[PDB]
């Protein structure tokens, strides 16, 4: 698989700042990495993940063969690290910096494992058909809503927000909300790639999901010249449709073995 073909686009929208981060790399001969991090309350947490997620994963690869298990551990460990980092910095705003994290690992060119927390997304496009790889952690979900309430948190409105502050129920960072139920533990999904059909991994932040459903994303991937043109087209449509938030898309082409 060729990382030269990865397409990526990130538009600030109408925000003062762009707090979306994204990355990809080949960790080892057998493992490729792809990630988006949608930061809020300052980029600190999103930046921390961007900077360190690869090390956390690579330190785990030889210890843990189950990649769902590995990503779960990595997420929790990096969250531990950011919490210490935050509590130690002079900048007291880090205490309320946090981020989604959507991380994909592809092993041996066929085994795709995705972990995320928050409302950024991964989908797989194959034959122009989307398959969802993540489910958004929002207060709308009964199970999430119940943990928040059982942990002592609440949900307010003006649209649902954890303790009147956070539009999602899991994240990396958000130190003050951790005991109120906003956990760093990801949900995970594992699939095998198709041997004959090409497929595309697409990572997006909620700026994009607000306005472009995942079928429409597969159409762009299916119709646009290269992944790069597709990534730009997806983000630009989101903005055209009325999105004002940071909008980020990563399009990864997988060849069929
Ligand atoms: Mg990197
Ligand atoms: Mg953000
Ligand atoms: Mg966002």
Separation CA 200–CA 125 (nearest Å): 5
Say how far apart CA 117 and CA 101 lie, in whole Å: 5
> 118 — phi, psi (to 5°)?
110, -155
Structural determination approach: X-ray
Inter-residue contact 201 to 124 (CB < 8 Å): yes
Domain span including residue 201: 1-257
Ligand 3 centroid vs 61 CA: distance in angstroms? 30
How far does the centroid of ligand 2 lie from the alpha carbon of residue 39, in Å? 4
Q: Closest Cα to residue 133, out of 70, 73, 32, 203?
A: 203
Radius of gyration of the chain (CA): 17
Q: Which ligand is nearest to the CA of 27?
A: 1
Task: Write out the two tokens for 1.
Answer: 């698989």
Using CA atoms, how far apart are residues 198 and 251, in angstroms rounded to an integer? 13
**Angle 224-225-226 from CA coordinates, rounded to 5°:** 100
What is the Å distance from ligand 2's center to 42 Cα? 8
Distances in whole angstroms, Cα of residue 165 to Cα of each of 147, 207, 209, 249: 16, 18, 20, 25
Judge contact between 198 and 168, C-beta under 8 A. Answer: no
Query: Tokens 């007291």 map to which residue?
Result: 92
Q: Among candidates 49, 136, 52, which has minimal Cα distance to 97?
A: 49
Q: Which two tokens stand for residue 183?
A: 């956990």
Cβ–Cβ under 8 Å, residues 117 and 141: no
DSSP labels, 123-139: EEEETTEEEE------T
Torsion of CA 119, 95, 176, 20, to 10 degrees: 0
Residue with tokens 């994204």: 22
65 C-alpha to ligand 2 centroid (Å):
32
Would you say 7 is a known binding-site residue?
A: no
Strand partners, 156: 161
Q: In the Cβ-directed half-sphere of 193, how many Cα atoms lie within 13 Å?
A: 26
Angle at 21 between CA 159 and CA 164, to 5 degrees: 20
User: Given in angstroms, what resolution was this structure solved at?
Assistant: 2.4
CATH number where 90 lies? 3.60.40.10
SS3 233: helix
Domains of the chain: total: 1
39 labeled part of a ligand binding site: yes
Distance 112 CA to ligand 2 centre (A): 26
């Amino acid at each position: 698989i060729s990382l030269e073909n990865v397409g990526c686009a990130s538009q600030i929208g109408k925000r003062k700042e762009n707090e979306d981060r994204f990355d990809f790399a080949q960790l080892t001969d057998e493992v490729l990495y792809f990630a988006v991090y949608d930061g809020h309350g300052g980029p600190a947490a999103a930046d921390f993940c961007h900077t360190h997620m690869e090390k956390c994963i690579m330190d785990l690869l030889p210890k843990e063969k189950n990649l769902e298990t590995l990503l779960t551990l990595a997420f929790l460990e990096i969250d531990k690290a950011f919490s210490s980092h935050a509590r130690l910095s002079a900048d007291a705003t880090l205490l309320t910096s946090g981020t989604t994290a959507t991380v994909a690992l592809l092993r041996d060119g066929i085994e795709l494992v995705v972990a995320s927390v928050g409302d950024s997304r991964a989908i797989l496009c194959r034959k122009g058909k989307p398959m969802k790889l993540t489910i958004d952690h929002t207060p709308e979900r009964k199970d999430e809503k119940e943990r928040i309430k059982k942990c002592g948190g609440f949900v307010a409105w003006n649209q649902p927000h954890v303790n009147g502050r956070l539009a999602m129920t899991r994240s990396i960072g958000d130190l003050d909300l951790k005991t109120s139920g906003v956990i760093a533990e990801p949900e995970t999904k594992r699939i095998k790639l198709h041997h004959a059909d090409d497929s595309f991994l697409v990572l997006t932040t909620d700026g994009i999901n607000f306005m472009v459903n995942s079928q429409e994303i597969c159409d762009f991937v299916n119709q646009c010249h290269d992944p790069n043109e597709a990534a730009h087209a997806v983000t630009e449509q989101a903005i055209q449709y009325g999105t004002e938030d940071n909008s980020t898309a990563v399009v990864v082409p997988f060849g069929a073995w």
